[PDB]
Design a protein around this ligand. Structure first.
Ligand SMILES: Nc1nccn2c([C@@H]3CC[C@H]4CCC(=O)N4C3)nc(-c3ccc(C(=O)Nc4cc(C(F)(F)F)ccn4)cc3OC3CC3)c12
Ligand SMILES: Nc1nccn2c([C@@H]3CC[C@H]4CCC(=O)N4C3)nc(-c3ccc(C(=O)Nc4cc(C(F)(F)F)ccn4)cc3OC3CC3)c12
Length: 266
């Protein structure tokens, strides 16, 4: 192995600063488009991160951002992945110029759902699913990335429910109260991600702080219907937020629900 020779990279454009590193667009061996992510020095538990990155090189799905290889014989480490020309899903949703149809928003949900069903089938949790960790290619296809990487973050503001950078707004009650992660905490976050999509990238619980969000969820209260979601779309995202984790659906059930709504609506 998975080691790419960094001398085979041509850097063409600075894409900016993403979460945990700078990303560049470039080519590999003069021909192939790639994204090159330079992992910020001191941000990750490096040996654990590299070992898991190499295991993850064996994952492949049309709706997962493909990992190609790594460059670990110098610092910063580089991760070489599929290049997603339309960038981060959250930024993309927030651009009102796109004038999305709701059928396009439901297709974005389905793309993510397929990717998560595949990760679950391979025994992987995402652990930080959110629009900010999804990317959009030149054809408008949404794919999931950054699966599992929260496990290697060294900054304590990101790693426990008490932290300022912890994804409180994408967490179920058992995560906020007891740090209980499971396939069902990924299901809850997926429902929040459908809410982000149908809200065109609004922050979940936008009028609340993280502390107030945790209290809201502790009182059994939830997000409410985005204007663009139909009653059936809202029923699907809401089903992800059952207080009892065992009552939440699986990704395979959500996928069936989404396809049924697509056929019915649009
Ligand atoms: N592939 C990309 N293509 C185009 C743009 N991209 C950006 C932009 C950065 C600037 C901001 C600014 C605005 C914008 O659109 N932005 C997006 N980040 C990535 C990107 C590249 C690599 C990985 C990456 O290395 N992922 C990874 C790596 C592993 C590992 F191998 F390490 F294990 C496992 C799982 N996933 C993740 C990426 O984006 C994260 C999802 C949002 C990419
Ligand atoms: N890593 C994989 N693991 C398992 C399955 N895989 C599949 C399946 C093929 C059958 C279909 C059918 C059904 C299914 O699930 N499918 C998926 N493709 C890849 C895979 C995808 C992309 C690249 C890839 O493009 N790699 C790359 C790319 C570059 C670049 F040129 F971009 F720079 C440089 C270096 N490496 C490499 C792949 O596997 C080979 C073993 C490593 C992988």
């Amino acid at each position: 192995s998975w080691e790419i020779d960094p001398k085979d990279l041509t850097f063409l454009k600075e894409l900016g600063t993403g979460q945990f590193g700078v990303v560049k667009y470039g080519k590999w061996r003069g021909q192939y488009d790639v994204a090159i992510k330079m992992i910020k020095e001191g941000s990750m538990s490096e040996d654990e991160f590299i070992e898991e990155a190499k295991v993850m090189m064996n994952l492949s799905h049309e709706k997962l951002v493909q990992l190609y290889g790594v460059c670990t014989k110098q610092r910063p480490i580089f991760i070489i992945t599929e290049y997603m020309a339309n960038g981060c899903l959250l930024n993309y949703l927030r651009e009102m110029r796109h004038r999305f149809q709701t059928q396009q928003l439901l297709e974005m949900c389905k793309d993510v759902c397929e990717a998560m069903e595949y990760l679950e089938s391979k025994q992987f949790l995402h652990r930080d699913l959110a629009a900010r960790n999804c990317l959009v290619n030149d054809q408008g296809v949404v794919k999931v990335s950054d699966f599992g990487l929260s496990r290697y973050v060294l900054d304590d503001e990101y790693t426990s429910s008490v932290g300022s950078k912890f994804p409180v707004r994408w967490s179920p009650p058992e995560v906020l109260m007891y740090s209980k992660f499971s396939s069902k905490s990924d299901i809850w976050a997926f429902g929040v991600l459908m809410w982000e999509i149908y809200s065109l990238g609004k922050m979940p619980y936008e009028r609340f702080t993280n502390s107030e969000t945790a209290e809201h969820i502790a009182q059994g209260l939830r997000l409410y219907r985005p204007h663009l979601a139909s009653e059936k779309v809202y029923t699907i995202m809401y089903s992800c937020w059952h207080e009892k984790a065992d009552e939440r659906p699986t990704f395979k059930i959500l996928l069936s629900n989404i396809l049924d709504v697509m056929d019915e609506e649009s």
